């Protein structure tokens, strides 16, 4: 209902998280306690390498099965990292925009009611990923889903979420300047002005957060295990 329907069909789950925020992009709530579970930390190419290294050992130390990967990693390498049992049947699960379609497409690759596809050794993978929508109870979670592009900028009505998101960004990257200074500067630098040469702060926020989520603002992670 409806990930609960799909879980019934599988014995293996691949949890596709964003490496920049492994906790905000975890599939909390939904139950994989009786499935073989691989934690996939994705988008390592746009994450802070050192932070990602900390996340790996954090999961390994917990006894958990964890891998890291990104768009540009070869299909062969991903498959080896995955190392699926020959009798695995697989659900790819996660929050929106975390790289699940891209992963399915690479595995697929492409070759040929709920649909499946098969790997060369016959392991079966569900063609469509289970999409997980979270109760956003904290503005911190909303901010973190914004930063990784799970929560699109068009959906943000509350300016406090933008502020929390910046505050997380700023701490991660080392910025000590204020919300106002930073966004005025960003609007200026990118020529985002309205009549009278007034910095368009709203366009600024929209472009900046779009760019952060795409990894265009640098290799930055938003959660640390330390923490
Ligand atoms: N930099 C980077 N971008 C990625 C990676 N995987 C996916 N993306 C991008 O993330 C966005 C969402 O990817 P998509 O596969 O459609 O996400 P989905 O909603 O989970 O299926 C797209 O803009 C992709 O181009 C990755 O490993 N690295």
UniProtKB/Swiss-Prot annotation:
Q: Which organism is it from?
A: Thermotoga maritima (strain ATCC 43589 / DSM 3109 / JCM 10099 / NBRC 100826 / MSB8)
Domain CP-type G intervals: 1-134
CDD domains with a match to the protein in the record: YlqF
* Gene Ontology CC terms, in alphabetical order: cytoplasm
Could you name the domain of life of the organism this protein comes from? Bacteria
Keyword check for Ligase: no
Descriptive protein name:
Ribosome biogenesis GTPase A
Biological role stated in the UniProt entry? Required for a late step of 50S ribosomal subunit assembly. Has GTPase activity. Binds to the 23S rRNA.
The entry assigns this protein to a family as follows: Belongs to the TRAFAC class YlqF/YawG GTPase family. MTG1 subfamily.
Question: Which biological process terms from the Gene Ontology are attached to this UniProt entry?
Answer: translation
Molecular function via GO? GTP binding; GTPase activity
Q: What is its main location?
A: cytoplasm
